[PDB]
Amino acid sequence: GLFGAIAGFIEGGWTGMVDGWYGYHHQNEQGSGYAADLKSTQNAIDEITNKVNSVIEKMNTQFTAVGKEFNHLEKRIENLNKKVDDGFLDIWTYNAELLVLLENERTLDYHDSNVKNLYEKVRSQLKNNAKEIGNGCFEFYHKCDNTCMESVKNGTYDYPKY
């Protein structure tokens, strides 16, 4: 919803496609088929993984034993100690709560970007040779066989065609 792609001009998702996060659904004479973009899906997985392994792996703690013992004549420093424990409780709770809210918003925008970026990367390939429906789908102006699609999803798409 930040790049207009996911849940935007491309309303729903394909329960059919199960090879990756982003892909295509071709429809020629040879037949219909869902095919996930390997390279793109493979890159996101590598980056999102690194993201999770950053939020986790950057938390390196010390070896300490929280909790101390005080007698009935040390209620003050007992409360001081409690203040230190509650201070650290509010700081980590808040920071962890917001860190997730923010990085969730960003992660969803990351996928939105990746989809839109995929759109555009194909749309400019084949400018005239097809028209934009508006639903993330293109309608070819010429016979596009399996090895024709294969050159679009491949990034190696000839224009000596019409």
């Binding site: 919803g1 996911i6 849940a7 491309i10 729903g12 998702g13 394909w14 329960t15 496609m17 199960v18 996060w21 982003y22 892909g23 295509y24 071709h26 020629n28 993201k51 999770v52 939020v55 950057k58 938390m59 703690t61 070896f63 034993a65 929280v66 909790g67 101390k68 013992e69 007698n71 424990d85 650290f88 409780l89 980590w92 709770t93 962890a96 709560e97 997730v100 809210l101 923010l102 990085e103 969730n104 918003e105 992660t107 969803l108 996928h111 939105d112 989809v115 995929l118 759109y119 194909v122 097809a130 429906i133 639903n135 993330g136 789908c137 293109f138 070819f140 016979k143 596009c144 699609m149």
Partner: protein, 321 residues
Amino acid sequence: DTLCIGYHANNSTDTVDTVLEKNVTVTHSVNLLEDKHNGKLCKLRGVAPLHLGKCNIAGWILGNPECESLSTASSWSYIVETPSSDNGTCYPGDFIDYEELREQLSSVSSFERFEIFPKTSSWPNHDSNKGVTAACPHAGAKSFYKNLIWLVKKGNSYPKLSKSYINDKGKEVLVLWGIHHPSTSADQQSLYQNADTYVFVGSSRYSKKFKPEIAIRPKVRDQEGRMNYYWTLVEPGDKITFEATGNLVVPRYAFAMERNAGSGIIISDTPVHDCNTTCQTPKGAINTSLPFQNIHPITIGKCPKYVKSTKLRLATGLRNI
């Protein structure tokens, strides 16, 4: 012919939250919050904890007749008391700097208990056999601490005693003793004949001299009298000198010790098991790599930060339709 570009979707129902939108369903997600423990008190470094069971720290080092089970353990990572351990100082009194000891004793790297002043050969001028009490019962019959000796007068005579131990161990030596305060001046002489006595303990760093405070205290475990407990650490090569004309509960057993500071004490009923853990809580151990946990604020070891959150679900996939 066509092509239409799109994204993945599945039967997943995992929801996450964002700054902008709440309960957003997604394809994939991980949890940053650990909320699961094994409900066991495990080892911590590689060494098991010291479980006192029926007794607490006080009763354990003093040698309360009930803590007369084991614990020979020469080292522990932390100490475990049960909320329902009440066997400590059976003889009413004040354990001076008790909490501090406990912290000194929380974790130890070597801990052997040796007989500092051998009972038989150390007190030839005082009675080391009448020193028992109904407050410290072992099998209905009167007893006393196993690591302390309640010296009394040997028939109408309490001569100035003067013993001293020199630390030849390659480590600190924890020495515990006691000062007894009789309830009445009649019991004072009946125990130590002299009516005006004094006790003096001294080392290279310690020096204190106590004066018995004779008076009637309210009955605690049937005693109107009191007995205060004291302790100190003697450096290697240093010596500690005891001197008294009465009222001195002398050391019988001391402790050669070496303390690796930085641990604590857990008061829990949670069973102690044979397992490794890097993080321990009263509730149980935590085996996790996650940055946060909501199990227990009181933690021991290298643990995740404690957080009030109920769930910290981090989205990895995308919006799921």
